Design a binder for this molecule. Structure first.
Ligand SMILES: Nc1ncnc2c1ncn2[C@@H]1O[C@H](COS(=O)(=O)NC(=O)C[C@H](N)c2ccccc2)[C@@H](O)[C@H]1O
Length: 396
């Protein structure tokens, strides 16, 4: 076992950073910023308000907000109250929003003034908390210390293949992720980390807690900054951001020379390409990161900074405390060179799919190699290379 904070919750790890780095910048959005102490206090105030409204272990709390500092306060508050959040994309079709609200059965939705009309337009019948109406400045600001377990729910991400399905992720996988980031990327409180992905895409979880579980600062990129490639490059350079994660298609539009500060560039979610990697791997640390939503992230490949061109782009090796099994249709293990289904075991596996027991049992099978554990069948095709890295080959 690679060490990590085995018994600690996500918010407990955040609180350790706020205690160690109270006056460091935690989060930036446009011309606003909050220190760790300020962010923690505001999240504690909201968390107490959420407790009074029934949030408890494995409660799912909907979030319908624009990306902003208050969006992150809402997330941390839900975790501190002992619950789990479900990010609901306010740009989805109304009927998809309604499906997620109704399927999740959430009894509380956190929103903002400019979004409250949409909440009414989807006919949501639960409790609605308009955060920029609430005056919480009077509430206690200290940490709550609610009961928590690593196996408690932390977030539910809806994805679609059929109808949307809620993928249930627990605290323990994100606690492991903290140690992965500190060990493998060397993340420290000095880093400045962009937030690029939608909060409905679990890459945003990776980005947000990359910053907030290590004392680093999280720079929430505005819509206009992302839309304009030169504005994006200027924003990263002016603010001296050190780490960013991007879709490969977005990265193809960027110029290394116009980004002066990055030490790590991660691409995730889609296949990268040898020409793309060769353009960046000798200017900074280029990382290809792979995973299904059902364990957030499973493998990483750091491209070699050796002034020699690569001809292909592996998805690399399992992250700490994650196991990869490449198997045939009978779940038998394959030798190097043989293509099979990529399956995953380890601490980051989702609990399953919300109120979908048969689908959960089909996809999160008994681990044939580790009695008493589960193994997730990704549906991705892959093979081991002779050097022990993994080549991604699409879908089985
Ligand atoms: N690096 C890849 N190369 C090539 N195909 C890929 C790759 N990363 C995913 N994929 C594909 O995308 C699927 C998962 O799609 S997803 O549920 O929308 N999640 C993501 O795309 C992001 C993923 N959860 C994640 C989050 C944070 C860090 C790393 C990865 C995988 O099963 C693969 O088919």
């Amino acid at each position: 076992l690679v060490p990590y904070a085995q018994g600690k919750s996500i918010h407990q790890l955040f609180e350790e950073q706020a205690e160690a780095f109270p006056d460091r910048v935690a989060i930036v959005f446009e011309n606003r910023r909050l220190s760790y102490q300020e962010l923690n206090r505001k999240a504690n105030q909201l968390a107490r308000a959420l407790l009074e409204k029934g949030v408890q272990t494995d409660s799912i709390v909907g979030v319908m907000m624009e990306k902003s500092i208050e969006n992150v306060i809402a997330i941390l508050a839900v975790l501190k109250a002992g619950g789990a959040y479900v990010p609901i994309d306010i740009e989805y079709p109304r009927d998809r929003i309604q499906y997620i609200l109704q399927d999740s059965q959430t009894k509380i939705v956190l929103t903002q003034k400019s979004v409250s009309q949409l909440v009414h337009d989807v006919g949501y019948s639960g409790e609605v908390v308009v955060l920029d109406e609430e005056q919480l400045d009077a509430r206690e600001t200290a940490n709550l210390h609610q009961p928590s377990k690593p196996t408690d729910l932390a977030y539910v991400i809806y994805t679609s293949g059929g109808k949307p399905k809620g993928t249930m992720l627990e605290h323990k996988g994100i606690a492991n992720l903290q140690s992965f980031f500190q060990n493998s990327f060397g993340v420290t409180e000095q880093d400045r980390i962009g937030l690029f992905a939608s909060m409905s895409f679990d890459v945003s979880v990776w980005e947000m807690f990359m910053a907030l579980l290590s004392g680093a600062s999280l720079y929430i990129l505005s819509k206009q900054t992302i839309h304009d490639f030169a504005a994006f490059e200027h924003y990263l350079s002016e603010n001296e951001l050190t780490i960013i994660t991007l879709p490969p298609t977005y990265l193809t539009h960027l110029t290394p020379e116009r980004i002066t500060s990055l030490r790590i560039m991660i691409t995730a979610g889609s296949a990268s390409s040898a020409p793309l990697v060769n353009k960046w791997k000798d200017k900074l640390r280029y990382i290809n990161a792979y995973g299904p939503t059902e364990c957030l992230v499973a493998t990483i490949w750091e491209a070699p900074s050796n002034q020699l061109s690569v001809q292909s782009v592996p998805i690399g090796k399992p992250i700490q405390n994650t196991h990869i099994y490449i198997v045939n249709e009978d779940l038998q293990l394959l030798p190097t060179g043989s293509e099979g289904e990529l399956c995953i075991g380890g601490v980051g596996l989702a609990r399953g799919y919300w109120n979908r027991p048969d689908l959960t049992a089909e996809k999160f099978v008994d681990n044939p190699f580790v009695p008493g554990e589960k193994m997730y069948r990704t549906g991705d095709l892959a093979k081991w290379l002779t050097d022990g890295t993994i080549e991604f080959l699409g879908r089985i």
